[PDB]
Design an enzyme around this catalytic site. Structure first.
Site, PDB file in Angstrom:
ATOM      1  N   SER A   1       0.799  -1.215   0.000  1.00 49.12           N
ATOM      2  CA  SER A   1       0.000   0.000   0.000  1.00 49.12           C
ATOM      3  C   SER A   1       0.839   1.275   0.000  1.00 49.12           C
ATOM      4  CB  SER A   1      -0.960  -0.026   1.197  1.00 49.12           C
ATOM      5  OG  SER A   1      -1.875  -1.130   1.109  1.00 49.12           O
TER       6      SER A   1
ATOM      7  N   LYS B   1       0.214   3.408  -2.918  1.00 49.39           N
ATOM      8  CA  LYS B   1      -0.896   4.360  -3.017  1.00 49.39           C
ATOM      9  C   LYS B   1      -0.371   5.774  -3.271  1.00 49.39           C
ATOM     10  CE  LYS B   1      -4.541   1.773  -0.718  1.00 49.39           C
ATOM     11  NZ  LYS B   1      -3.835   0.510  -0.556  1.00 49.39           N
TER      12      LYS B   1
ATOM     13  N   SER C   1      -6.218   3.080   3.730  1.00 53.08           N
ATOM     14  CA  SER C   1      -5.576   2.156   2.806  1.00 53.08           C
ATOM     15  C   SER C   1      -6.621   1.290   2.093  1.00 53.08           C
ATOM     16  CB  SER C   1      -4.543   1.301   3.548  1.00 53.08           C
ATOM     17  OG  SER C   1      -3.468   0.961   2.700  1.00 53.08           O
TER      18      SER C   1
ATOM     19  N   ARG D   1       5.421  -0.388  13.358  1.00 53.65           N
ATOM     20  CA  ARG D   1       5.972   0.382  12.252  1.00 53.65           C
ATOM     21  C   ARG D   1       6.184   1.837  12.664  1.00 53.65           C
ATOM     22  NH1 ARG D   1       1.491  -1.114   7.848  1.00 53.65           N
ATOM     23  NH2 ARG D   1       0.262  -0.405   9.654  1.00 53.65           N
TER      24      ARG D   1
HETATM   25  B1  LIG Z   1      -1.880  -2.256   2.019  1.00 58.74           B
HETATM   26  O1  LIG Z   1      -0.532  -2.583   2.122  1.00 58.74           O
HETATM   27  O2  LIG Z   1      -2.180  -1.474   3.207  1.00 58.74           O
HETATM   28  C1  LIG Z   1      -2.656  -2.138   4.361  1.00 58.74           C
HETATM   29  C2  LIG Z   1      -3.428  -3.318   4.270  1.00 58.74           C
HETATM   30  C3  LIG Z   1      -3.874  -3.897   5.464  1.00 58.74           C
HETATM   31  C4  LIG Z   1      -3.526  -3.381   6.704  1.00 58.74           C
HETATM   32  C5  LIG Z   1      -2.730  -2.205   6.806  1.00 58.74           C
HETATM   33  F1  LIG Z   1      -2.382  -1.693   7.981  1.00 58.74           F
HETATM   34  C6  LIG Z   1      -2.283  -1.552   5.594  1.00 58.74           C
HETATM   35  C7  LIG Z   1      -1.390  -0.297   5.719  1.00 58.74           C
HETATM   36  O3  LIG Z   1      -0.186  -0.518   5.904  1.00 58.74           O
HETATM   37  O4  LIG Z   1      -1.948   0.800   5.623  1.00 58.74           O
HETATM   38  C8  LIG Z   1      -3.759  -3.741   2.933  1.00 58.74           C
HETATM   39  C9  LIG Z   1      -4.540  -3.031   1.916  1.00 58.74           C
HETATM   40  C10 LIG Z   1      -3.089  -3.176   1.717  1.00 58.74           C
END
Ligand SMILES: *[B@@]1([O])OC2=C([C]=[C]C(F)=C2C([O])=O)[C]2[C][C]21
Ligand SMILES: *[B@@]1([O])OC2=C([C]=[C]C(F)=C2C([O])=O)[C]2[C][C]21
Ligand SMILES: [Cl-]
Ligand SMILES: [Mg+2]
Ligand SMILES: [Mg+2]
Ligand SMILES: [Mg+2]
Ligand SMILES: [Mg+2]
Lengths: 242, 243
Positions: free
Chosen positions: B48, B51, B96, B228
């Site tokens: 993500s 994005k 996300s 993170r």
């Molecule tokens: B993406 O990598 O972003 C994401 C997902 C699931 C949980 C998350 F915390 C995050 C993020 O890092 O914002 C899925 C949809 C993808």
């Protein structure tokens, strides 16, 4: 039109102060205030004028972008943060008067007057020094008029470029967490009585925006922190922020 | 433009029985810092964090008219509850919302997506796979140091897309702000190929400097996603970047 909520007076009374908070719920097109009279009372905008001044300086190219450096003139002033070079971001953050006085001189009184008329800003009166009329000249704006102007800026509806409006909204950024974003500008009017503090801006939520404008009696600088504190108490009471 | 390897940052990872890399870039001094030069240069799926380029391309091509345009929920209830509603660019980034960005990617199309990533010099520029999923399970790969190079261009409005598109995406990246700093960033989480990892990439704006950052860490379950930001913030605090 506006709903009056006098219970918010409790947040001012706690600090032996008086003032007004005005809220506008953009989705519902409803307004709320603790004092319908003071909500419409026009004061010097003081440093809240840095919002329209920034917009005008950007649109006329007096400020090229938010990175352009305006060097300190070498004169040591009572606010230590003013005694250094600044850009638009830091000059807004520290409310650096001498930087905005240079903007105003370069804008000039003819263009300043026309833009404030185009903005429908307050009483549209710039009588006084071209580089201090928002501190000790003729310009007067009420809290509800501040909401009106801020709503145009939020919607990019003011008579300047979209880019200018986006840059100023960036420069207004004050606080952001995962629950809300506050874009705002403080002001402290001391040159002319009554000394008052301002906070004007808005709160961005996921699905709505709440505009606010507050001012309060401010006899000494010791109470400046109450501008944000009391506003946030009203926002919490109204469930806008947790 | 040199690099220092500061291995003391590893203590913030080992406290949580984690392993990962933080990369910092001091813009004023053109100096890079990392706890692990090897992993700083290893390439992974962006997940993500993609994005960020995806938003820029969608905006520049007019797939997204502005940050208010609504992209409707497709009515399929998914695991992350905040996904199951209409979104705009701001909220889609915040939560996300993959399904919204998959629609973007389908409208962008393979040829324009490929051209844009080459012009961005983004990672290995390889979009092999499905146009609406290659950042999750296709051929695109990017290192933490390559994330910095891309982010620096975005900060300076040096990408070839419009200044407006770059400003809007940086507004959408806004994550935290106070009287001391502003963080613009995007999280990522990649599980479809090994190793499963979490990302956080972006920058810290100070009064007089900008610190770019890109971190990733092993993410064997979703239980550790909050590390993170917490480990990155520990490194920023250790380096006196934020109080
Ligand atoms: B993406 O990598 O972003 C994401 C997902 C699931 C949980 C998350 F915390 C995050 C993020 O890092 O914002 C899925 C949809 C993808
Ligand atoms: B202005 O109204 O802004 C200002 C001053 C002094 C103290 C402050 F807190 C503030 C403010 O609200 O930012 C003087 C320079 C003007
Ligand atoms: Cl912003
Ligand atoms: Mg109280
Ligand atoms: Mg008028
Ligand atoms: Mg720790
Ligand atoms: Mg290349």
């Amino acid at each position: 039109g506006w709903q009056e909520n006098k219970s918010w007076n409790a947040h001012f009374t706690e600090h032996k102060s008086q003032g007004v908070v005005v809220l506008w719920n953009e989705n519902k097109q409803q307004g709320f205030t603790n004092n319908l009279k003071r909500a419409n009372q026009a004061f010097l905008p003081a440093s809240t004028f840095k919002i329209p001044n920034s917009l005008i300086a950007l649109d006329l190219g007096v400020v090229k972008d938010e990175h352009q450096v305006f060097k300190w003139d070498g004169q040591t002033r009572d606010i230590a943060t003013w005694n250094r070079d600044h850009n638009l971001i830091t000059a807004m953050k520290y409310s650096v008067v001498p930087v905005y006085q240079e903007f105003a001189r370069q804008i000039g009184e003819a263009r300043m007057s026309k833009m404030l008329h185009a903005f429908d800003y307050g009483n549209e009166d710039i009588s006084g020094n071209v580089d201090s009329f928002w501190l000790d000249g003729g310009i007067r704006i009420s809290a509800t008029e501040q909401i009106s102007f801020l709503r145009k800026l939020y919607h990019n509806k003011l008579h300047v470029s979209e880019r200018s409006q986006r840059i100023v909204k960036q420069a207004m950024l004050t606080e952001a967490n995962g629950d809300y974003i506050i874009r705002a500008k403080t002001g402290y009017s001391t040159r002319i009585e009554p000394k008052i503090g301002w906070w004007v801006g808005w709160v961005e939520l996921d699905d709505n925006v709440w505009f606010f404008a507050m001012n309060m009696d401010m006899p000494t600088s010791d109470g400046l922190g109450l501008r944000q504190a009391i506003t946030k108490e009203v926002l919490k009471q109204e469930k806008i922020i947790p």
